[PDB]
Write a protein that binds this ligand. Structure first.
Ligand code: 8PT
Length: 261
């Protein structure tokens, strides 16, 4: 088929995903270059919703300059009916890539962590705490991870789901405060999965015994032993249940694990 964004024309190759009321497509331009265009339908969007979108769109536009661990946004068209965003295309998101993976080259892993750490640090420098990080927020592109979203009334799924609640930090649960250390807990959980093949509370079906466990210090998390003692440490340092005890992004960047060898 086909479509138009700011005059320029793109032919559709396939849909990649859906959610909210928005599709993401892979597409080709006039020069046969490949891109990803996200379409959002605003016909049922309240004013709040709409401001949240203008808000992420602006933050993404801005943070482009500051890191290449953020997804490139090349162009966009915005009206009262719809938004189109022309973006750089990934090969696969990280949730899907980790679903269909048997085990991880410990090098690839350290390299991904480096990427995650850079990207999340970046949004923190600009005032943003994501507070709902999952692997699905990360997209793989030339062997690099790039962060896709930041915080909106936002939801995506390829064609796992959302809410999930295995990356959720204690303080987000006690809230019924949130801060940068919240993004360390979630990043820790992701790294734990990339390390032990599951998330720390993954094997607790009952959604409520899971929430109770996350906030309960007497419930101790198992950190089985491994050749990379450092990796074991980082994990213990990210998964402190008290934010004040938890390590920080600038500290993680200086940590032996991402620095040594
Ligand atoms: C081409 C491609 C295929 C996939 N999949 C490969 C098969 O497994 C699930 C979908 C995932 C991401 C991408 N590339 C790709 N994907 C995106 N995905 C969005 C839409 C659906 C869930 C992940 C978030 C992109 N957003 C901005 N630029 C993107 N570039």
């Amino acid at each position: 088929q086909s479509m138009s964004v700011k005059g320029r024309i793109y032919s559709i190759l396939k849909q990649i995903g859906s959610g909210g009321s928005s599709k993401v497509f892979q597409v080709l331009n006039e020069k046969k270059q490949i891109y990803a265009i996200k379409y959002v339908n605003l016909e049922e969007a309240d004013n709040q919703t709409l401001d949240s979108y203008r808000n992420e769109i602006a933050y993404l536009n801005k943070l482009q300059q500051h890191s290449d661990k953020i997804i490139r946004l090349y162009d966009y068209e915005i009206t009262d009916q719809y938004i189109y965003m022309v973006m750089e295309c990934g090969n696969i998101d990280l949730n899907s890539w980790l679903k269909k993976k048997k085990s991880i080259d410990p090098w690839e892993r350290k390299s991904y962590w480096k990427n995650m750490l850079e990207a999340v640090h970046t949004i923190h420098q600009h005032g943003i705490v994501h507070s709902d990080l999952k692997p699905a927020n990360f997209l793989i592109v030339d062997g690099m991870l790039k962060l896709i979203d930041f915080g909106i009334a936002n939801q995506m799924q390829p064609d796992s789901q959302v809410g999930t609640v295995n990356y959720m930090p204690p303080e987000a649960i006690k809230d019924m405060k949130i801060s940068p250390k919240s993004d360390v807990w979630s990043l820790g959980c992701i790294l734990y999965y990339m390390t032990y093949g599951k998330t720390p509370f993954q094997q607790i079906i009952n959604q409520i015994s899971k929430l109770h466990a996350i906030i309960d210090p007497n419930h101790e998390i198992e950190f089985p032993d491994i050749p990379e003692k450092d990796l074991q440490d980082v994990l213990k340092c990210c998964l402190k249940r008290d934010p004040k005890q938890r390590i920080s992004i600038p500290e993680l960047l200086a940590h032996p694990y991402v620095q040594i060898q």
